[PDB]
Amino acid sequence: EVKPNPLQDANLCSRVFFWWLNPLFKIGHKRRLEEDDMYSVLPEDRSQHLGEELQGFWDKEVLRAENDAQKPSLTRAIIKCYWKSYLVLGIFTLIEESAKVIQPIFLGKIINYFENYDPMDSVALNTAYAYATVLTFCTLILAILHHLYFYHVQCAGMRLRVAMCHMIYRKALRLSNMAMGKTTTGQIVNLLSNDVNKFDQVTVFLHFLWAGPLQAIAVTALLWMEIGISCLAGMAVLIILLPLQSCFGKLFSSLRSKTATFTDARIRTMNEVITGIRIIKMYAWEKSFSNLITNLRKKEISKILRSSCLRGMNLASFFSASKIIVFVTFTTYVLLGSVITASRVFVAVTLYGAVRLTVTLFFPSAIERVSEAIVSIRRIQTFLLLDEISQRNRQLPSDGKKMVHVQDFTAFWDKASETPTLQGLSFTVRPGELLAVVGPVGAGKSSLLSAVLGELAPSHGLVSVHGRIAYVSQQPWVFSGTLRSNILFGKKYEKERYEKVIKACALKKDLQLLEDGDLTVIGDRGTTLSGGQKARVNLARAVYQDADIYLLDDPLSAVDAEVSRHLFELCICQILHEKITILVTHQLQYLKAASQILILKDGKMVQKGTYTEGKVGFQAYKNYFRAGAHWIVFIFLILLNTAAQVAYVLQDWWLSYWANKQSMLNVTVNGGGNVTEKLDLNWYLGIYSGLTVATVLFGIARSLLVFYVLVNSSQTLHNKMFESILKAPVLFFDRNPIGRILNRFSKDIGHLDDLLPLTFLDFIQTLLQVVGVVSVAVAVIPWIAIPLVPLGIIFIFLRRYFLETSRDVKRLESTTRSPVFSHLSSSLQGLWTIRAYKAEERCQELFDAHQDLHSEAWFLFLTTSRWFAVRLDAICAMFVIIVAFGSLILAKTLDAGQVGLALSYALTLMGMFQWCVRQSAEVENMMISVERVIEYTDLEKEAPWEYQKRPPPAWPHEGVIIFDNVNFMYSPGGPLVLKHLTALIKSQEKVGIVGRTGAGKSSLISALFRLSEPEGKIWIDKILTTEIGLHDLRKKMSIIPQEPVLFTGTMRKNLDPFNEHTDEELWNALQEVQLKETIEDLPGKMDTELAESGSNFSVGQRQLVCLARAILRKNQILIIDEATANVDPRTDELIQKKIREKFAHCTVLTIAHRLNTIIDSDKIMVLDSGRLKEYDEPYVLLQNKESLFYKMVQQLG
Ligand SMILES: C[C@@H]1CC[C@@]2(OC1)O[C@H]1C[C@H]3[C@@H]4CC=C5C[C@@H](OCCC(CO)CO)CC[C@]5(C)[C@H]4CC[C@]3(C)[C@H]1[C@@H]2C
Ligand SMILES: C[C@@H]1CC[C@@]2(OC1)O[C@H]1C[C@H]3[C@@H]4CC=C5C[C@@H](OCCC(CO)CO)CC[C@]5(C)[C@H]4CC[C@]3(C)[C@H]1[C@@H]2C
Ligand SMILES: C[C@@H]1CC[C@@]2(OC1)O[C@H]1C[C@H]3[C@@H]4CC=C5C[C@@H](OCCC(CO)CO)CC[C@]5(C)[C@H]4CC[C@]3(C)[C@H]1[C@@H]2C
Ligand SMILES: C[C@@H]1CC[C@@]2(OC1)O[C@H]1C[C@H]3[C@@H]4CC=C5C[C@@H](OCCC(CO)CO)CC[C@]5(C)[C@H]4CC[C@]3(C)[C@H]1[C@@H]2C
Ligand SMILES: C[C@@H]1CC[C@@]2(OC1)O[C@H]1C[C@H]3[C@@H]4CC=C5C[C@@H](OCCC(CO)CO)CC[C@]5(C)[C@H]4CC[C@]3(C)[C@H]1[C@@H]2C
Ligand SMILES: C[C@@H]1CC[C@@]2(OC1)O[C@H]1C[C@H]3[C@@H]4CC=C5C[C@@H](OCCC(CO)CO)CC[C@]5(C)[C@H]4CC[C@]3(C)[C@H]1[C@@H]2C
Ligand SMILES: C[C@@H]1CC[C@@]2(OC1)O[C@H]1C[C@H]3[C@@H]4CC=C5C[C@@H](OCCC(CO)CO)CC[C@]5(C)[C@H]4CC[C@]3(C)[C@H]1[C@@H]2C
Ligand SMILES: C[C@@H]1CC[C@@]2(OC1)O[C@H]1C[C@H]3[C@@H]4CC=C5C[C@@H](OCCC(CO)CO)CC[C@]5(C)[C@H]4CC[C@]3(C)[C@H]1[C@@H]2C
Ligand SMILES: C[C@@H]1CC[C@@]2(OC1)O[C@H]1C[C@H]3[C@@H]4CC=C5C[C@@H](OCCC(CO)CO)CC[C@]5(C)[C@H]4CC[C@]3(C)[C@H]1[C@@H]2C
Ligand SMILES: C[C@@H]1CC[C@@]2(OC1)O[C@H]1C[C@H]3[C@@H]4CC=C5C[C@@H](OCCC(CO)CO)CC[C@]5(C)[C@H]4CC[C@]3(C)[C@H]1[C@@H]2C
Ligand SMILES: C[C@@H]1CC[C@@]2(OC1)O[C@H]1C[C@H]3[C@@H]4CC=C5C[C@@H](OCCC(CO)CO)CC[C@]5(C)[C@H]4CC[C@]3(C)[C@H]1[C@@H]2C
Ligand SMILES: C[C@@H]1CC[C@@]2(OC1)O[C@H]1C[C@H]3[C@@H]4CC=C5C[C@@H](OCCC(CO)CO)CC[C@]5(C)[C@H]4CC[C@]3(C)[C@H]1[C@@H]2C
Ligand SMILES: C[C@@H]1CC[C@@]2(OC1)O[C@H]1C[C@H]3[C@@H]4CC=C5C[C@@H](OCCC(CO)CO)CC[C@]5(C)[C@H]4CC[C@]3(C)[C@H]1[C@@H]2C
Ligand SMILES: C[C@@H]1CC[C@@]2(OC1)O[C@H]1C[C@H]3[C@@H]4CC=C5C[C@@H](OCCC(CO)CO)CC[C@]5(C)[C@H]4CC[C@]3(C)[C@H]1[C@@H]2C
Ligand SMILES: CN(Cc1cnc2nc(N)nc(N)c2n1)c1ccc(C(=O)N[C@@H](CCC(=O)O)C(=O)O)cc1
Ligand SMILES: Nc1ncnc2c1ncn2[C@@H]1O[C@H](COP(=O)(O)OP(=O)(O)NP(=O)(O)O)[C@@H](O)[C@H]1O
Ligand SMILES: CCCCCCCCCCCCCCCC(=O)O
Ligand SMILES: [Mg+2]
User: Fold this and answer.
1) At 459, which CATH number?
2) How many Å lie between the centroid of ligand 5 and the Cα of residue 367?
3) Where in the sequence is the signal peptide annotated?
């Protein structure tokens, strides 16, 4: 196979340290990874194996439920399948919990040694060394073993996901027709896409369901044994932290919902602006959409700011939660009359930190993921119990005959429907005869196709279909694979028959067309073909695959007569000599190749007659931030962050200093306790309370400020983007697909509004916490700086060596995930022919291969992530060992408080470091959206809407426009389309100027509607067109598009978005233009909210309302962008009467392919190669004596 998984031959040490992954990274560092550089899935992880095992378990569960007469449970089957393999990992989770719980005990033993320091006690030093050895043993167990266990847990989750997908596909291939109608293909694709990924997550935290509450209990016990009932107080706060935060989360969700609605609305308008941007710029309607989007964005940014404030409050609350817990518990401790010591204080601090992280991060996450997985299992289960075809029976004996007969069959697509689709049909088919049903679609040719017991199971009829069915559908379908596979469809390669189809079936054209040849791989979803090829290849599969019964829904209609005649002589008469030839047709040639004709209506068979009857630079970050706020604000922000972290560390430093001062104090004030230098509770307690209050306040302020500045940056960037895009040239929209721009406006902006601020704030917070831990350790033991310089350096290199590969693997997993869904989708389009060919196992194997490839991707992703995690935690464990033992080596220059503080922070460095590195990677990956946003933010814009000119009103005094040696450039650096066009429009005249091409007539538009870029001297109103701004130029030009599109919003906004017409004006304007009978009946009257792009208005009414807007607009000219021809005839007679008296107020120029629309026009601009050779009236031109007019009259018609 491919390079076999080294995990098979990997020994225990290599598997724990992921040593076997080393070669891959090497190649991952040498070049770019592909699918060939991949590792095959393990034999026990193959999709077929897991699918079969879960099939057995689920079938057993179904049988048990049926025996005991209750609804079967999928959760029961999943548990009964994976519980043995999961409880062992729960064993390891017990071990991990025990190590995490008992590490602070040995921390307290070392600190107690420091508390009772005696330089002459060697035995105490040896005991402390042994305690440090046990502590580092525990942290290595925690470091390299939680990661091996985590990889196994994630592998279990991936196994569950793969088995579930195999289950779903196996069910889908056996789904029913009416069930297919009940459930859409989108629902099933969604099941494979987002509803099954939850199983990849729940398994991560499932064991915590019993690990969290238990560990918590244990911690409480230990805490009691240290400080008694006071510990409970701290625990109480932790408990309070569980509901309240969850409660706020609920509120969070609510706010999110509201924002969603606004976003959708905005996005809708976004689509409506980008798809019809040409029209928006054509009509000079930019102000209306601009203000509408401004209002929508303002509301959205208000709701997003509220949600961001809530999330920032949550982050600040968790950041300061440890201090609140410690402050409460130790204030209770001191106020009860006790005296604090470094050992007990820092044991309590470490235990509280561990238990708080567990209880407040893993347990609620475990509950949330379990609930999501439960609802997903419920949905997937109700799909697996979705009614399947009432059991599709293996076909009845194909005993050499072709005896089929239908006698008063009343069974349809939906049995409950009383309206007959097919019945009356009562005939008998004999072996070898050729039949061919021909006639109108009717209501049952599909039933004759499905007469293979597809969807017409006989309620009263009885059809003995014998033989092998070759079904061809209305829409031919081509599956994912190689052209050999689609032609072959499981059949063995037969060269001569393949040649036979290439000659008789005339596929040599396709051989020529394919870019690779006879080895050409069918593209994804089989696109490397055309409709003729898919229909022909369906018939080709049937005839090559030498089936017996051939059901063809008009495949010879699509193909040409040559191939059709070839298959009658060669195939239908000779090769398909003893095959069923059900062929619907409408030409006269397959009508005359047939022997029997079937014509159908609702049910009753009328007759049976015969014939004669990579990274983002500092510029990106700088522009994002300076887009956020003034650099003074950023100086204030970094000062606030530093103050917050300083207060966070100093709250514990105050406890440590109390301990250090307390150590000197124990020496004189405790042992020599007669003087009773009682600690001034007011003084000491006040500084402690002030420090913790300052920590809380500074954390809250920093979180709020970061969120506010980032959200403000997002809002300014979005506003700038809309303003910039609104001024984008039509060239940008022509070059860039609509989907690309819509995606840039939707996904990146959603990122910048939701994910980027939160991730950036979390990364900054965690990085500051890590820096605080490192600085505490360095401050306590300065020599710790010496080994820290190499370690960090190594980390940097390591990071690169991972990322350079990691991104690639991630990219690979993205490109390997969409094929699976497409194959499922492919199965859904052609399920009929899949069941027709009895090819369920082949499609199952193809889906299994697609899933196995994606399983390779997912396995690589999990394993590489664990490799990096193992090395990072090894670095952190090395740091903890270094701190604890360098503390032990000297000890002379250190006291209990400093050692306790430093060790507790080293004991917390691990999780924080993991969070910070992964979050930094996430931020760096997500900043590509910011890069794209800045790219759109600075695209080239056109001339300003108003320049300086500003003509006096009543401007279109003359309406005279001329062109004077213009050399047209359609696109900069493109072809030449107009060279010295010299038209003449008189003053104060109901006369117009029109060109023809989307760029020649747009040249006219550049002169007035402003959409192309003519070079030549242009005289509008005896003033050059150039000096007039965009809108001040766009204002006096009325126009009708090829497709008079309609925009979502009120009816009032569509008729007049600028509100320049008084109400009785719209009333009498629509009655004069006769739309009033249509609009009076509209429920919204004038302010009717239109449907999706004006669905209710007819196309005749859409052109009518655009001409009507122009009429209220009261311009003197109007351009019909080749629209006098694509006019509905009531409108044609109408528009003739219009330019006689109704558009009398607007000038129409009729350029068209409908000659009747142009004979009436006063002037015709004849153009060859896009050039005006002759310019005079049509009447001289229309007769025979004329050059080009006579050519269009002759040849063009
Ligand atoms: C995960 C597990 C949790 C429980 C547990 O294991 C790991 O935690 C360990 C702590 C250990 C003690 C630590 C300190 C010393 C001092 C040392 O001093 C020798 C002095 C001599 C020089 O050799 C003369 O100077 C003798 C041994 C002793 C008492 C350990 C005994 C075993 C203990 C109890 C272990 C216990 C089974
Ligand atoms: C509700 C939450 C879940 C359960 C739990 O947390 C809170 O509820 C707490 C009750 C605590 C015990 C109450 C009283 C004492 C007596 C004391 O002094 C006398 C000693 C002498 C008595 O016979 C000889 O042992 C020693 C400690 C002990 C046993 C407590 C231990 C911790 C315990 C089990 C805590 C436990 C983890
Ligand atoms: C959900 C709940 C939130 C918080 C809470 O429980 C859980 O946290 C507990 C802490 C308790 C105090 C701890 C110790 C004592 C002992 C005794 O005073 C010493 C007497 C004598 C002994 O030798 C001289 O030392 C009297 C009672 C007192 C003050 C407790 C009162 C109730 C308190 C405040 C509890 C409070 C309701
Ligand atoms: C965990 C949650 C956060 C809020 C809270 O619990 C829930 O946190 C607890 C702190 C408790 C106080 C701690 C200490 C004392 C001193 C004692 O005085 C006799 C001392 C004696 C020897 O020192 C003679 O001097 C009387 C009781 C009192 C005031 C407690 C009252 C209840 C308080 C306020 C609790 C409060 C409701
Ligand atoms: C602290 C004590 C020790 C531990 C423990 O007890 C208390 O903590 C509890 C957490 C409980 C689960 C939390 C959430 C759910 C989801 C729900 O599914 C959605 C259904 C809904 C969707 O809309 C309605 O349809 C099903 C129940 C389940 C899995 C709980 C199971 C029992 C559990 C494991 C309990 C466990 C024994
Ligand atoms: C990012 C920033 C880099 C620099 C910096 O912050 C973070 O690093 C901090 C460390 C601080 C010192 C720590 C300990 C002491 C000892 C004591 O000196 C004798 C006192 C004696 C005679 O007065 C008493 O009897 C007090 C002062 C001193 C030197 C601190 C000074 C400020 C310093 C330099 C801070 C400085 C602004
Ligand atoms: C981004 C953040 C900006 C600020 C910050 O981090 C990064 O900068 C660090 C400065 C550190 C203190 C410097 C000096 C000491 C003295 C030491 O004792 C000396 C005794 C001596 C006798 O020989 C040596 O042995 C005890 C600790 C303490 C107070 C430090 C605590 C942590 C502090 C506050 C850190 C603080 C959080
Ligand atoms: C921008 C940042 C704002 C905060 C901050 O930096 C800059 O401001 C600094 C002030 C520092 C303290 C100055 C003096 C002392 C006294 C010393 O006690 C000697 C006892 C005895 C020995 O002989 C005397 O004779 C212990 C250390 C301590 C408390 C410093 C702690 C760290 C502090 C709080 C620093 C803190 C990180
Ligand atoms: C940002 C935060 C604000 C500032 C702050 O944290 C950071 O900085 C810390 C430094 C601490 C002081 C260090 C050393 C001394 C020793 C001794 O000095 C007696 C001198 C007096 C009598 O002889 C002369 O008249 C008494 C205690 C004192 C002043 C500490 C008190 C608490 C202080 C001010 C802490 C305070 C909360
Ligand atoms: C940052 C925010 C501002 C408010 C605040 O946090 C949040 O700031 C904290 C500082 C605390 C005070 C510090 C020092 C003392 C002196 C002591 O006695 C002195 C006697 C003698 C010297 O020995 C005088 O010369 C009495 C208590 C008192 C006033 C504290 C009270 C509580 C206070 C006000 C805290 C308060 C909650
Ligand atoms: C972070 C939170 C906000 C700020 C704050 O709380 C915590 O940080 C503390 C800094 C403290 C002062 C620093 C240095 C000393 C000198 C020393 O000795 C000289 C005084 C002498 C007479 O001149 C007699 O001691 C002790 C007193 C004093 C002035 C502190 C007072 C309390 C203050 C103002 C606290 C303040 C409210
Ligand atoms: C984000 C950054 C992480 C790293 C870092 O900043 C923040 O963390 C700070 C901790 C600082 C030390 C704290 C305490 C002291 C004691 C003092 O005692 C002199 C007494 C006498 C004998 O020399 C004077 O004559 C000497 C200096 C020293 C060791 C600091 C050095 C600078 C350090 C390492 C800082 C370092 C750049
Ligand atoms: C790149 C890294 C930056 C940090 C660091 O490494 C390199 O820079 C080093 C400088 C060292 C100090 C130098 C001088 C002295 C004087 C001495 O007083 C007795 C003097 C007597 C006997 O030496 C003369 O003969 C006490 C110790 C002290 C303060 C050192 C402490 C450790 C320090 C801070 C080291 C620290 C780990
Ligand atoms: C804690 C763990 C320690 C080991 C380890 O993980 C962490 O550290 C990682 C760093 C990786 C190396 C980075 C760069 C090079 C480049 C090139 O050699 C240049 C040679 C030239 C440079 O100066 C002269 O020597 C070839 C590859 C090599 C050596 C990488 C190999 C794999 C290494 C050793 C990884 C290894 C698994
Ligand atoms: C300490 N910390 C910081 C942090 C940041 N934001 C938070 N936000 C909230 N709401 N709650 C928290 N507890 C929290 N914690 C952590 C710790 C662990 C993980 C964690 O769940 N998992 C692994 C990786 C697993 C994963 O989440 O994908 C890690 O990187 O530490 C996340 C954040
Ligand atoms: N999915 C379906 N659900 C219900 N009824 C259906 C379905 N598909 C087809 N029908 C029935 O069949 C009718 C369509 O005519 P059909 O028998 O498919 O003609 P045809 O095969 O399209 N003929 P031609 O186009 O000339 O090859 C429908 O109007 C229904 O009566
Ligand atoms: C304490 C953890 C810090 C993590 C922050 C990331 C620091 C990365 C510094 C190097 C950036 C990348 C250098 C070029 C290589 C690349 O293309 O990624
Ligand atoms: Mg049909």
Assistant:
1) 3.40.50.300
2) 7
3) none
Cβ 972 under 6 angstroms from ligand 4: no
- Give the separation between CA 834 and CA 846, rounded to whole angstroms: 13
Residue 774 CA to ligand 9 center (angstroms) comes to 24
Other C-beta atoms within 10 Å of 710: how many?
24
Q: What are the DSSP calls for 491-557, one per residue?
A: ----HHHHHHHHHTTT-HHHHHHSSS-TTPPP-GGG-SS-HHHHHHHHHHHHHHTT-SEEEESSHHH
Cα atoms found within 13 Å of the Cα of residue 4, Cβ hemisphere only: 6
Tokens 């979390």 sit at which residue?
A: 762
Ligand 16 binding pocket mutation candidate from 441, 455, 538, 598 (most atoms within 8 A of CB): 441
Nearest partner of 424 among 449, 396, 455, 447, judged by Cα:
447
Nearest alpha-carbon partner for 32 in 614, 855, 523, 481? 614
Query: Which residue type occupies 51?
Result: G
Q: Residues near ligand 3 with C-beta < 6 Å? A: 229, 232-233, 236, 336-337
Please report how the helices 756-780 and 896-937 are oriented relative to each other, as an axis angle in degrees rounded to 10.
Answer: 150
What is the rounded (10 degree) CA torsion for 1130, 1133, 1138, 1141?
-130
Q: How many CA atoms lie within 13 A of 200 on its CB side?
A: 15
Beta bridge partners of 175: 388
Supply the range of the domain harboring residue 506: 403-613
Amino acid identity for residue 1192 in this structure: M
Residues ≥6 apart with Cβ < 8 Å to 1104: 1073, 1075, 1131
Query: For the chain, how many residues are written?
Result: 1197
Q: b or e along 830-864 (b: 16 or more beta carbons within 10 Å of the residue's beta carbon)?
A: bbbbbbbbebeeebbebbbbbbbbbbbbbbbbbbb
Do residues 245 and 360 touch, judged by C-beta distance below 8 A? yes
Neighbours of ion ligand 18 (CB under 5 A): 445-446
User: Quick check: 896 and 342 in contact, CB under 8 A?
Assistant: yes
Does residue 467 contact residue 549 with C-beta atoms inside 8 Å?
A: yes
Structure tokens at 259: 């924002």
CB atoms within 10 A of CB 1076: 15
Instruction: Give, in order, the Cα–Cα distances in Å from 481 to each of 490, 521, 625.
Output: 11, 7, 48
What is the CA(322)–ligand 8 centre distance, in A?
23
Please return the burial class of 413, using the count of CB atoms within 10 Å of its CB with bins 0-12, 13-18 and 19+: middle
Torsions phi, psi for 80 (to 5 deg)? -60, -20
Residues 6+ apart with CB under 8 A from 1068: none
3-state helix, strand, coil in the chain (%, to 5): 65, 5, 30
CA-CA-CA-CA torsion sign (903, 906, 912, 916): positive
**Among 855, 702, 58, residue whose Cα is nearest residue 381:** 58
In this structure, what DSSP letter does residue 1039 have? E
DSSP assigned state of 489: T
Whether 923 and 760 have beta carbons less than 8 Å apart is answered as yes
Give the resolution to one decimal, in Å: 3.0
